[PDB]
Paper text:
Based on the overall more similar kinetics with Glc and Gal, we expected the V546C mutant to behave structurally more similar to H167A (and the wild type) than does the H450G variant. Thus, the binding of Gal is identical to that of Glc binding for productive oxidation at C2. For all GAL mutants investigated here, the axial O4 group in 3FGal can in fact be accommodated in the productive 2-oxidation binding mode without introducing a smaller side chain at position 169. Not only is the axial O4 group spatially accommodated in the GAL mutants, but also receiving stabilizing hydrogen bonds from Asp452 and Thr169. Stabilizing interactions are offered by Asp452 Oδ2 and Thr169 Oγ1 to the axial C4 hydroxyl group in Gal, which is expected to facilitate binding of Gal oriented for productive 2-oxidation, presumably also to promote conversion to the 2-keto galactose product.
The reaction catalyzed by TmP2O is of the ping-pong type involving a reductive and an oxidative half-reaction.
Numbering used by the authors:
A (entry chain A), B (entry chain B): 43 to 618
C (entry chain C): 92 to 181
D (entry chain C): 454 to 543
């Protein structure tokens, strides 16, 4: 390990990888530290779903997701177990057990909130949905000039999209995809527009999709290498970053204290620029552990010296979920253009169509696929081919339906994976609502209890706000009920429901961006720089100050591209 | 990819890795193919449990195991879902859905049987318990000479033990381990001997254990490299091996037909020597699809051309399981030697013991750990330290208790992990029975139905035989209930029970060894050579022909070592 | 119409369930594969426990039940007694 | 008549039940018939059903009824966990 860097990045997630790509590219000497390790194969921080085996057994990936989702704050446990043998050691109290947080009020939690500690962060398992925010969900980067703000955002998002390889055609030939898309388009004709969920992904084959990841943004290989001889990068995995160190005048970061988890060694790392991209929870944790904001249970009669808005105004989306079983009607429509004579299983059976007939309801590629499934698998009662890709349908957030929609198949299922209904019938529904930023919704850190890595235990104090949030959330549940009925009835076991607060993992605002610290109640300016500090920057969904329903990672990434612009304007790469 | 190699190995499990370490070591130009991919990090085929994060959160590791166990044979589902919406598409029959096997009788299955397709195979998630078999459990390698046979086994097991880094002292300094060990020793004094489970593992720190894997056996790196400049090895992952091609005379294999899962291309690979180490199911699958045994539902009217015992005489172990909550008596006994000075949390509070005191019931290392824990955590009502390593206790298989026993903490829990009861109180009990090999017990493959890799679908026809196996299983359950009661009462939610058949993954005998194909009803000789064929070898628990209780991996390894001794003598490495 | 039940209205479900005898229960095909290998174990899904083997479980009224007590189903019903409008009426 | 284990965490004063009931077209093919070989608990010909809600109006109304319930109930309160909207066993 070296001593002096131009730039140090904490976290090797997609946002840390954005800083790495911009800055390593522009010639900065860069170190990146991650508390987690490389486990996802030779491509470092790559999507764990990009194995042939997972994509042939997609029901199984849920387990990978669960295995690397460590809950953020688990209230103390009060379940009554009163059928222990009387010789068994039994508690008198519900005492602090199994890593639980005794600070946590179980009724004001985001109990589904969880973090992932591996190289590549959550991008080694995410769904890859990368929508842009429209204006209503999105912070301003230029005020009083909408066209300049829009134009800035378009430029940022267009770059972010090329980093993620975001596209909207990777499922264009799915029968199930088009079944639902065409149906929804017809039903809502001229009230809402549907399209492919934009996905960070490239299709390799009819049966395999390369899902994007941190790795796609930046390959995390150490440089100089053969392919980058003039670049300087080093990744230090299994290194826990603990504190940034402030100068006396609170105007500069002097160093970063780390703990090497293998050797157990501690160092102070010196850099020109300090970049924090450890996730919306752990960025806050690190900053709070370095004298920013207020350690311990909020106490207003002890106002913070620095960043009084840190861990306030946090946002998490409401999530409603169901699955549906496709209607008899939609299923019969799959084969509307077919002429089926005789009986299945007999030498007399035939299934045929007229190629390029004006009145065919489906294109030739569809009917060809149906014909071949039906002829080659005459035992099967359904017209959908066995390896037909899943739906990937959305109507994006609009003011008259202010929620994000996914009508799709997610690898992260929420129950036992049911086996009695054919998966070809199944569609998932996930509507995400936006949450008003409210001061009283807080992420804070205990001054007594600590986590698995001996940092202050995160604690939530969260409720979905009264008024618009709660009303939109219920109007979103009902919308899901109304829309999904158009495709088929609910699947027993996946009835329409609100999911645990936090489960959707779109936490925002915990170190929020604004124009002005006091007047916008924020922690970083529009360059994502920390107020007061020449050389400390924060990257992530924690920066996002607005109420949004769409998946936030593309937006976080865009903000990180703008952050890099400022850094290249204000610090010089060391000579190589 | 080269076209011609000296030896080709199918599968990168510990057993394939045994053949590679011996043969690459001996100068042979070796290619290894695995259907699965490198997905464990920079140490190829290494144990997924060997990350700081998993050892800080061992509960979460159940999810990694689940995520790579893919059920072998799933019977057609006949659960009634009669609450669908009337608009939903609804079945008229229980048709073949979701990759279910319609050949499989659900009352004669190994429903818990699963396979793992990753580089390293199952050793990337296994428990690492590696005991030797006593004579009772073990195939003969020399007849009419017991002492010579014992000497041959002990020579093979000692080598096998170094390759895996097996040892019996990595948990020597765990309180819980010794709490359990000492009490069971005393309870069964003169009657049974208790010890640490032999574990393929090397302790690195008081809180970190490097579990062994295929990687420990052979690092799977391509050679020549710097550390081995004169050896020749190529690993090709994502390659489905489909067929060995037999010559017309059935005397020799002429090629291995592979399918590259990434490009889609198919190849014929040529080697002097071919080794199948794809697991007890998959080896059998590749054999059958190559013309050995009998494809399709067993048909005694058509006796097979080659290897009639293949897929017959299959063994899997009964497994009974519970968890216990440690007795009050035992938990009190953990602090027996301590002198306590008043009220915890208070000023008066002091905990001390007398090192070396002969009146002590426990060792100094024990008392220093309790003392330290009870002084730094006065809020805690238990005398066990928070990161005390888990128990790892066994009384090995014997005539008067013919079953292997494990009294420990397994990363594979079978239900939702519970959090009402402190994890320091819980001990798992797993007893494994031995199963007599019967002809009627079978693993066969459909001549119509294929798997996710478009290869013949495996199907079981199994029952635990009446007679000694059944009586010993029931006896085995009484014994777990009786023995476990001496430590604590059953944990609710893990009551004493028989686990689904096949869940314990100790399947043997599917391509079994013996001296003589007919008399011993077997598929390979004691060099693991397939009868009739000069250059075809099989590796794995598939070879073991006996009724055994202990974990088979180490035994299969030993057979593989013997097998490579034959190979080294009878084939010559190509010139470099 | 007991003081005890209208003071414990949740406990009445139990009285209902106590007198609803299912009309046609199809043969059970649930797989139980964790029996002790000594316990007597079925080779087939045979006719067990009053099940109706004539009954196709995918074309059932599985919830249909009957009550055999004087006063029949009126000893437990909810007492909703709307009139049918013409559209619903013979 | 409650259908699951009754929950105890939410105050009952807050709880409201929603039951909507659809009409079914009478169709010849929907039968209640009786075995000539199997018998019930009182030695009478065992009842056997052959039923499915008719496609068409009956089916369409039933889905729409589900949606109506979802839409209506939202006006009063969100769904109680454990009692999510569902079609009951026929
Ligand atoms: C788990 C999950 C997440 C997403 C989706 C699916 C599921 C099941 N779906 C998805 C998401 N969002 C997208 O917009 N859309 C999709 O459809 N998911 C969210 C997305 O996954 C995250 O927003 C994104 O990765 C965040 O990027 P990041 O801000 O770079 O944060 P990460 O958590 O990914 O990476 C942080 C990183 O830092 C580490 N760490 C944490 N603490 C420390 C300390 N103290 N020192 C050093 N390193 C630290 C981690 O280990 C980690 O890699
Ligand atoms: C998953 C499991 C495994 C065991 C225990 C715990 C759990 C949860 N713990 C345990 C084990 N056994 C022991 O002796 N003691 C324990 O403490 N478990 C089982 C053990 O893990 C296995 O017995 C052992 O690995 C067997 O090794 P192997 O014979 O080399 O077989 P593997 O299945 O590990 O590796 C085979 C390998 O081949 C591949 N493959 C399969 N088919 C093909 C084809 N057609 N072409 C190419 N490659 C193929 C795989 O992908 C794989 O890696
Ligand atoms: C159980 C139940 C049923 C009703 C509701 C709720 C509950 C859980 N709620 C409800 C009812 N219907 C209303 O319109 N509104 C409500 O709000 N329920 C249904 C109502 O309960 C029935 O519709 C009504 O009783 C039917 O009346 P019935 O034609 O008089 O028939 P019953 O089934 O009540 O009583 C018949 C009776 O005959 C006997 N029996 C049966 N077989 C024989 C033979 N072979 N020999 C002699 N006697 C026989 C019985 O034992 C019984 O007492
Ligand atoms: O809860 C599952 C969801 O979680 C998120 O974080 C993703 O953005 C969604 F696309 C979806 O997979
Ligand atoms: O089912 C869990 C078991 O899996 C077997 O294969 C192992 O050998 C046992 F040690 C235990 O982990």
């Amino acid at each position: 390990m070296d001593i002096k860097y131009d730039v140090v990045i904490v976290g090797s997630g997609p946002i840390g990888c954005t800083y790495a790509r911009e800055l390593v590219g522009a010639g900065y000497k860069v170190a990146m530290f991650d508390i987690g390790e490389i486990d996802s194969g030779l491509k470092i921080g790559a999507h764990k779903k990009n194995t042939v085996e997972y994509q042939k057994n997609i029901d199984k990936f849920v387990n990978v997701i669960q295995g690397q989702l460590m809950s953020v704050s688990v209230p103390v446990n009060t379940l009554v177990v009163d059928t222990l043998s009387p010789t068994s050691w039994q508690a008198s109290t519900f005492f602090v057990r199994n890593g639980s947080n005794p600070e946590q009020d179980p009724l004001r939690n985001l109990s589904g909130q969880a973090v992932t500690r591996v190289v590549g962060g959550m991008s080694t398992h995410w769904t890859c949905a990368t929508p842009r925010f429209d204006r209503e969900q999105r912070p301003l980067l230029v005020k009083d000039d909408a066209d300049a703000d829009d134009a800035e955002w378009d430029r940022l998002y267009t770059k972010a999209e090329s980093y993620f390889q975001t596209g909207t055609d990777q499922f264009k030939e799915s029968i199930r995809h088009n079944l639902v898309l065409n149906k929804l388009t017809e039903e809502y004709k001229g009230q809402r527009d549907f399209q492919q969920i934009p996905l960070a992904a490239t299709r390799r084959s009819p049966t395999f999709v390369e899902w994007s990841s941190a790795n796609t943004v930046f390959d995390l290989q150490n440089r100089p290498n053969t392919d980058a001889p003039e670049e300087r990068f080093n990744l230090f995995p299994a290194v826990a970053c603990e504190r940034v160190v402030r100068n006396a005048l609170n105007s500069e970061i002097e160093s970063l204290h780390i703990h090497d988890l293998i050797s157990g060694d501690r160092f102070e790392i010196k850099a020109d620029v300090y970049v924090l991209t450890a996730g919306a929870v752990h960025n806050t944790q690190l900053l709070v552990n370095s004298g920013f904001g207020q350690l311990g249970r909020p106490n207003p009669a002890n106002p913070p010296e620095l960043l009084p808005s840190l861990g306030s105004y946090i946002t998490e989306q409401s999530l409603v979920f169901c699955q549906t079983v496709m209607s008899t009607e939609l299923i019969d429509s799959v084969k509307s253009d077919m002429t089926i004579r005789g009986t299945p299983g007999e030498l007399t059976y035939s299934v045929t169509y007229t190629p390029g007939a004006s009145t065919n309801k489906h294109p030739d590629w569809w009917n060809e696929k149906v014909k071949n499934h039906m002829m080659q698998h005459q035992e099967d009662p359904l017209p959908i081919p066995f390896e037909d890709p899943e739906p990937q349908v959305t109507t994006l957030f609009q003011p008259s339906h202010p929620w994000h929609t996914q009508i799709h198949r997610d690898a992260f299922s929420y129950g036992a994976v049911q086996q009695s209904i054919d998966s070809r019938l199944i569609v998932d529904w996930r509507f995400f609502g936006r949450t008003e930023p409210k001061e009283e919704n807080k992420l804070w850190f205990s001054d007594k209890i600590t986590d698995a890595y001996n940092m202050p235990q995160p604690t939530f104090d969260f409720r979905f706000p009264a008024g618009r949030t709660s009303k939109e959330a219920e109007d979103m549940m009902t919308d899901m009920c109304v829309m999904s009925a158009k495709i088929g009835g609910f699947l027993p076991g996946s009835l329409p429901q609100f999911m645990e607060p936090g489960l959707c993992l779109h936490l925002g605002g915990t170190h929020r961006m604004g124009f002005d610290e006091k007047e916008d109640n924020c922690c970083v300016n529009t360059d994502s720089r920390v107020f007061g500090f020449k050389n400390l920057f924060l990257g992530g969904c924690g920066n996002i100050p607005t109420a949004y329903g769409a998946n936030p990672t593309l937006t976080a990434m865009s903000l990180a591209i703008k952050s890099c612009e400022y850094i290249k304007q204000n610090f010089t790469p060391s000579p190589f």
